[PDB]
Tab-separated table of C-alpha atoms and ligand atoms in Angstrom:
chain	number	residue	atom	x	y	z
A	7	UNK	CA	102.619	51.387	127.846
A	8	UNK	CA	103.639	55.021	127.299
A	9	UNK	CA	103.431	58.315	129.157
A	10	UNK	CA	101.189	61.039	127.873
A	11	UNK	CA	102.947	64.329	127.265
A	12	UNK	CA	101.557	67.454	128.880
A	13	UNK	CA	99.547	69.590	126.473
A	14	UNK	CA	100.489	73.201	127.206
A	15	UNK	CA	97.835	75.900	126.857
A	16	UNK	CA	98.931	78.426	124.178
A	17	UNK	CA	98.326	81.441	126.438
A	18	UNK	CA	101.026	79.956	128.689
A	19	UNK	CA	103.920	80.246	126.184
A	20	UNK	CA	105.642	83.301	124.684
A	21	UNK	CA	108.349	83.009	122.039
A	22	UNK	CA	111.057	85.649	122.481
A	23	UNK	CA	114.091	85.021	120.220
A	24	UNK	CA	114.963	82.620	117.412
A	25	UNK	CA	117.997	80.546	118.327
A	26	UNK	CA	118.120	78.148	115.340
A	27	UNK	CA	116.346	76.978	112.213
A	28	UNK	CA	116.180	73.810	110.117
A	29	UNK	CA	114.314	71.927	107.324
A	30	UNK	CA	111.354	71.552	109.705
A	31	UNK	CA	110.864	74.816	111.571
A	32	UNK	CA	112.770	76.808	114.156
A	33	UNK	CA	113.827	76.759	117.792
A	34	UNK	CA	113.171	79.834	119.921
A	35	UNK	CA	114.026	80.867	123.421
A	36	UNK	CA	110.866	81.797	125.270
A	37	UNK	CA	109.087	82.001	128.621
A	38	UNK	CA	106.543	79.612	130.162
A	39	UNK	CA	104.154	80.450	132.988
A	40	UNK	CA	103.860	78.122	135.965
A	45	UNK	CA	105.870	81.615	138.191
A	46	UNK	CA	107.622	82.176	134.847
A	47	UNK	CA	110.570	80.111	133.609
A	48	UNK	CA	112.719	80.204	130.444
A	49	UNK	CA	112.080	77.413	127.956
A	50	UNK	CA	113.133	76.416	124.466
A	51	UNK	CA	110.356	76.159	121.876
A	52	UNK	CA	110.603	74.148	118.641
A	53	UNK	CA	107.996	74.923	115.983
A	54	UNK	CA	106.905	72.988	112.917
A	55	UNK	CA	106.625	75.060	109.737
A	56	UNK	CA	103.002	75.487	108.698
A	57	UNK	CA	103.687	73.965	105.288
A	58	UNK	CA	104.871	70.519	106.345
A	59	UNK	CA	104.741	67.089	104.804
A	60	UNK	CA	102.522	64.771	106.828
A	61	UNK	CA	105.647	62.633	107.185
A	62	UNK	CA	107.130	65.650	108.959
A	63	UNK	CA	104.044	66.005	111.159
A	64	UNK	CA	104.205	62.375	112.297
A	65	UNK	CA	107.963	62.707	112.792
A	66	UNK	CA	107.449	65.949	114.722
A	67	UNK	CA	104.844	64.633	117.159
A	68	UNK	CA	106.669	61.302	117.370
A	69	UNK	CA	109.788	63.093	118.601
A	70	UNK	CA	107.749	64.692	121.397
A	71	UNK	CA	106.349	61.269	122.243
A	72	UNK	CA	109.820	59.757	122.632
A	73	UNK	CA	111.092	62.662	124.722
A	74	UNK	CA	108.104	62.392	127.081
A	75	UNK	CA	109.009	58.789	127.901
A	76	UNK	CA	112.258	59.771	129.665
A	77	UNK	CA	112.845	61.285	133.113
A	78	UNK	CA	116.506	61.708	133.956
A	79	UNK	CA	118.866	64.519	135.025
A	80	UNK	CA	121.068	64.027	131.936
A	81	UNK	CA	118.268	63.830	129.354
A	82	UNK	CA	116.663	67.035	128.069
A	83	UNK	CA	113.470	67.649	130.027
A	84	UNK	CA	110.228	67.981	128.090
A	85	UNK	CA	107.784	70.484	129.545
A	86	UNK	CA	105.017	69.754	127.053
A	87	UNK	CA	103.670	70.093	123.529
A	88	UNK	CA	101.225	72.354	121.725
A	89	UNK	CA	99.731	69.766	119.382
A	90	UNK	CA	96.187	71.068	118.807
A	91	UNK	CA	96.892	74.574	117.472
A	92	UNK	CA	99.083	76.310	114.904
A	93	UNK	CA	101.954	76.626	115.128
A	94	UNK	CA	102.662	73.237	116.717
A	95	UNK	CA	105.439	73.311	119.291
A	96	UNK	CA	107.638	71.102	121.451
A	97	UNK	CA	108.692	72.887	124.666
A	98	UNK	CA	111.766	71.920	126.730
A	99	UNK	CA	113.926	73.331	129.493
A	100	UNK	CA	116.256	76.091	128.305
A	101	UNK	CA	119.932	75.070	128.313
A	102	UNK	CA	121.799	78.349	128.672
A	103	UNK	CA	125.069	77.332	126.998
A	104	UNK	CA	123.575	75.462	124.010
A	105	UNK	CA	125.205	72.723	121.968
A	106	UNK	CA	128.302	71.146	123.504
A	107	UNK	CA	130.439	71.103	120.361
A	108	UNK	CA	129.944	74.791	119.574
A	109	UNK	CA	130.244	75.661	123.271
A	110	UNK	CA	133.620	73.968	123.692
A	111	UNK	CA	134.994	75.541	120.513
A	112	UNK	CA	134.046	78.975	121.893
A	113	UNK	CA	135.508	78.142	125.338
A	114	UNK	CA	138.812	76.480	124.408
A	115	UNK	CA	141.132	75.889	127.375
A	116	UNK	CA	138.881	77.544	129.975
A	117	UNK	CA	137.956	74.419	131.989
A	118	UNK	CA	139.787	72.098	134.330
A	119	UNK	CA	140.200	68.408	133.478
A	120	UNK	CA	138.000	67.595	136.479
A	121	UNK	CA	135.282	69.802	134.975
A	122	UNK	CA	135.568	68.126	131.571
A	123	UNK	CA	135.370	64.653	133.143
A	124	UNK	CA	132.320	65.677	135.156
A	125	UNK	CA	130.703	66.695	131.864
A	126	UNK	CA	131.482	63.246	130.457
A	127	UNK	CA	130.082	61.486	133.536
A	128	UNK	CA	126.800	63.313	132.950
A	129	UNK	CA	126.600	62.247	129.330
A	130	UNK	CA	127.439	58.645	130.231
A	131	UNK	CA	124.735	58.584	132.915
A	132	UNK	CA	122.166	59.874	130.431
A	133	UNK	CA	123.250	57.217	127.923
A	134	UNK	CA	123.104	54.452	130.545
A	135	UNK	CA	119.506	55.438	131.228
A	136	UNK	CA	118.606	55.478	127.507
A	137	UNK	CA	120.294	52.119	126.962
A	138	UNK	CA	118.595	50.466	129.882
A	139	UNK	CA	115.270	51.898	128.667
A	140	UNK	CA	116.009	49.999	125.390
A	141	UNK	CA	116.575	53.186	123.347
A	142	UNK	CA	119.448	53.154	120.856
A	143	UNK	CA	120.336	56.737	119.995
A	144	UNK	CA	122.325	56.013	116.788
A	145	UNK	CA	123.458	59.650	116.577
A	146	UNK	CA	125.522	60.351	119.690
A	147	UNK	CA	127.842	63.337	119.099
A	148	UNK	CA	128.683	66.544	120.933
A	149	UNK	CA	126.387	68.435	118.524
A	150	UNK	CA	123.436	66.544	120.029
A	151	UNK	CA	124.377	67.316	123.662
A	152	UNK	CA	123.251	70.526	125.394
A	153	UNK	CA	124.930	72.350	128.323
A	154	UNK	CA	123.228	74.364	131.065
A	155	UNK	CA	124.661	76.999	133.417
A	156	UNK	CA	125.649	74.349	135.960
A	157	UNK	CA	127.825	72.733	133.243
A	158	UNK	CA	125.368	69.831	133.162
A	159	UNK	CA	125.408	68.013	129.819
A	160	UNK	CA	122.157	66.419	128.629
A	161	UNK	CA	121.449	64.121	125.691
A	162	UNK	CA	119.075	66.146	123.624
A	163	UNK	CA	118.205	65.192	120.036
A	164	UNK	CA	115.590	62.492	119.412
A	165	UNK	CA	114.563	63.224	115.831
A	166	UNK	CA	113.034	60.233	114.096
A	167	UNK	CA	114.337	60.194	110.504
A	168	UNK	CA	118.094	59.507	110.290
A	169	UNK	CA	120.224	57.977	107.528
A	170	UNK	CA	123.879	56.961	107.647
A	171	UNK	CA	126.242	59.289	105.797
A	172	UNK	CA	127.070	57.995	102.291
A	173	UNK	CA	124.470	55.180	102.586
A	174	UNK	CA	124.536	53.659	99.065
A	175	UNK	CA	120.784	52.950	99.226
A	176	UNK	CA	120.103	56.693	99.566
A	177	UNK	CA	118.861	58.662	96.554
A	178	UNK	CA	118.299	62.320	95.702
A	179	UNK	CA	114.915	62.151	97.476
A	183	UNK	CA	119.309	64.129	109.140
A	184	UNK	CA	122.534	62.284	108.343
A	185	UNK	CA	124.482	60.223	110.854
A	186	UNK	CA	128.205	60.805	110.245
A	187	UNK	CA	130.432	57.814	109.524
A	188	UNK	CA	133.282	58.939	111.751
A	189	UNK	CA	131.117	58.878	114.890
A	190	UNK	CA	129.694	55.459	114.054
A	191	UNK	CA	130.817	51.992	115.177
A	192	UNK	CA	132.170	49.618	112.476
A	193	UNK	CA	129.379	47.021	112.757
A	194	UNK	CA	126.776	49.759	112.338
A	195	UNK	CA	128.481	50.855	109.106
A	196	UNK	CA	129.358	47.426	107.743
A	197	UNK	CA	126.101	45.589	108.468
A	198	UNK	CA	123.652	48.115	109.894
A	199	UNK	CA	123.818	46.793	113.484
A	200	UNK	CA	122.930	49.748	115.750
A	201	UNK	CA	122.874	48.825	119.465
A	202	UNK	CA	123.793	50.382	122.787
A	203	UNK	CA	127.283	48.976	122.108
A	204	UNK	CA	127.577	51.090	118.958
A	205	UNK	CA	126.399	54.026	121.083
A	206	UNK	CA	129.370	53.224	123.366
A	207	UNK	CA	131.744	53.597	120.400
A	208	UNK	CA	130.223	57.015	119.669
A	209	UNK	CA	130.549	57.968	123.313
A	210	UNK	CA	134.268	57.306	122.975
A	211	UNK	CA	134.304	59.819	120.097
A	212	UNK	CA	132.352	62.272	122.317
A	213	UNK	CA	135.010	61.787	125.016
A	214	UNK	CA	137.683	62.762	122.505
A	215	UNK	CA	135.636	65.755	121.339
A	216	UNK	CA	135.283	67.013	124.904
A	217	UNK	CA	138.940	66.472	125.797
A	218	UNK	CA	140.051	68.341	122.637
A	219	UNK	CA	137.580	71.236	123.156
A	220	UNK	CA	135.673	70.377	120.023
A	221	UNK	CA	138.300	69.182	117.552
A	222	UNK	CA	136.903	67.342	114.563
A	223	UNK	CA	137.598	63.599	114.832
A	224	UNK	CA	140.125	62.348	112.248
A	225	UNK	CA	140.547	65.945	110.904
A	226	UNK	CA	140.568	66.011	107.073
A	227	UNK	CA	140.695	62.216	106.492
A	228	UNK	CA	137.972	61.108	104.110
A	229	UNK	CA	135.235	58.722	105.231
A	230	UNK	CA	136.925	55.825	103.472
A	231	UNK	CA	140.334	56.757	104.890
A	232	UNK	CA	138.783	56.732	108.376
A	233	UNK	CA	137.136	53.347	107.850
A	234	UNK	CA	140.316	51.791	106.465
A	235	UNK	CA	142.379	53.234	109.320
A	236	UNK	CA	139.918	51.881	111.890
A	237	UNK	CA	139.843	48.442	110.270
A	238	UNK	CA	143.657	48.346	110.241
A	239	UNK	CA	143.695	49.004	113.994
A	240	UNK	CA	144.527	52.704	114.120
A	241	UNK	CA	142.660	54.945	116.561
A	242	UNK	CA	142.448	58.619	117.483
A	243	UNK	CA	145.532	59.860	119.386
A	244	UNK	CA	145.668	61.052	123.016
A	245	UNK	CA	144.489	64.687	123.325
A	246	UNK	CA	146.937	67.053	124.955
A	247	UNK	CA	146.470	67.106	128.751
A	248	UNK	CA	144.164	64.053	128.597
A	249	UNK	CA	144.660	61.862	131.702
A	250	UNK	CA	145.951	58.398	130.866
A	251	UNK	CA	142.940	56.728	132.458
A	252	UNK	CA	140.591	58.770	130.255
A	253	UNK	CA	142.442	57.870	127.074
A	254	UNK	CA	142.435	54.196	128.094
A	255	UNK	CA	138.669	54.458	128.543
A	256	UNK	CA	138.104	55.893	125.042
A	257	UNK	CA	140.269	53.099	123.587
A	258	UNK	CA	138.111	50.512	125.315
A	259	UNK	CA	135.042	52.131	123.728
A	260	UNK	CA	136.755	51.708	120.349
A	261	UNK	CA	137.232	47.944	120.538
A	262	UNK	CA	136.486	46.425	117.141
A	263	UNK	CA	134.684	43.540	118.889
A	264	UNK	CA	131.393	44.772	120.414
A	265	UNK	CA	131.662	42.353	123.331
A	266	UNK	CA	134.944	43.909	124.476
A	267	UNK	CA	133.567	47.425	124.885
A	268	UNK	CA	132.481	48.660	128.300
A	269	UNK	CA	128.838	49.088	129.059
A	270	UNK	CA	127.597	52.537	129.982
A	271	UNK	CA	127.288	51.176	133.499
A	272	UNK	CA	131.007	50.435	133.457
A	273	UNK	CA	131.788	53.896	132.081
A	274	UNK	CA	129.792	55.732	134.770
A	275	UNK	CA	131.502	53.714	137.496
A	276	UNK	CA	135.004	54.293	136.085
A	277	UNK	CA	134.327	58.019	135.721
A	278	UNK	CA	132.953	58.189	139.251
A	279	UNK	CA	136.084	56.482	140.576
A	280	UNK	CA	138.351	59.053	138.911
A	281	UNK	CA	136.255	62.059	139.987
A	282	UNK	CA	136.397	61.041	143.660
A	283	UNK	CA	140.138	60.282	143.416
A	284	UNK	CA	140.879	63.341	141.274
A	285	UNK	CA	144.666	63.128	141.307
A	286	UNK	CA	144.143	60.302	138.820
A	287	UNK	CA	143.212	63.106	136.405
A	288	UNK	CA	146.757	64.522	136.341
A	289	UNK	CA	148.519	61.210	135.546
A	290	UNK	CA	149.052	61.528	131.779
A	291	UNK	CA	149.624	58.848	129.149
A	292	UNK	CA	153.190	57.653	128.608
A	293	UNK	CA	154.935	56.325	125.496
A	294	UNK	CA	154.157	52.688	124.298
B	301	LIG	C1	116.466	69.560	122.243
B	301	LIG	C2	115.158	69.888	121.884
B	301	LIG	C3	114.413	68.941	121.176
B	301	LIG	C4	113.105	69.212	120.796
B	301	LIG	C5	112.534	70.437	121.121
B	301	LIG	C6	113.261	71.398	121.825
B	301	LIG	CL1	112.470	72.896	122.191
B	301	LIG	C7	114.586	71.126	122.201
B	301	LIG	N1	115.321	72.035	122.908
B	301	LIG	C8	116.255	72.812	122.289
B	301	LIG	O1	116.461	72.750	121.077
B	301	LIG	C9	117.013	73.640	123.048
B	301	LIG	C10	117.061	73.724	124.394
B	301	LIG	N2	117.937	74.657	124.868
B	301	LIG	C11	118.626	75.315	123.926
B	301	LIG	N3	119.532	76.246	124.234
B	301	LIG	C12	120.328	76.877	123.336
B	301	LIG	C13	120.617	78.212	123.591
B	301	LIG	C14	121.439	78.943	122.730
B	301	LIG	C15	121.987	78.326	121.608
B	301	LIG	C16	121.715	76.989	121.342
B	301	LIG	C17	122.286	76.390	120.211
B	301	LIG	O2	122.857	75.302	120.283
B	301	LIG	N4	122.225	77.112	119.083
B	301	LIG	C18	122.818	76.651	117.803
B	301	LIG	C19	121.969	75.602	117.139
B	301	LIG	C20	122.575	75.612	115.728
B	301	LIG	N5	123.099	76.985	115.536
B	301	LIG	C21	122.684	77.719	116.753
B	301	LIG	C22	120.895	76.267	122.212
B	301	LIG	S1	118.138	74.748	122.401
């Protein structure tokens, strides 16, 4: 059983400005009538492979199945006319990774942790709806003008970076991915929890690149030898301990998203926890 997605009448949508472009089409900021709200509008290039068309509409189908504060809201689709569009709420501050790198140092630790609680709540909902994201990273999170972070990208065709089965005919990066997903292709909500740990580190570093200039095989060897990302400056000790739990080599030892939300709620309501920093050993 699945939800239909609203079909939006074309006279109801006006594209205003391009905000991005990819191997499929573009994303615009626009306006939608209801009495007139800003939206984001993703088009499919007239000149698409049918594979792209099925992937394009399939992405709208997946998005329409979700209804949660921390998951990008789908307003509807224009599927019967050209150009074909997917229409969502407009997130004023855009992608989280680029946003933090433009806004370095400007937020309180309590604000950063509230951002991470939002993401974790969105991921708990996805996981309990039996949806494995496989591609959780700050680049796939969007931020609105209330600082609310929403999980946003649900594109269908994804391949692991450096997958040996790949040939010359989007890529999921190794250094966001759990070991069991790399070593034997086991993607689950528990490998999403690993990636969430990496997202935690990205947020607490204002968008630093995980493992810096280490190569993919240097990262994998470091991880397998038991090394992990270091504590970001000003990161509360309890937050670093939480990322380290997400990075347990054994799946079973990682927290569930339900545990993460609860832990983050505890700290937010007792916010002097967020000034106790990590010590040495
Ligand atoms: C997430 C999503 C999936 C399918 C279809 C659609 Cl329409 C969407 N929604 C969006 O892409 C967006 C919703 N809100 C957005 N706001 C926004 C505003 C300004 C900048 C950005 C942004 O991240 N831009 C960078 C993307 C890459 N380089 C430019 C995003 S994009």
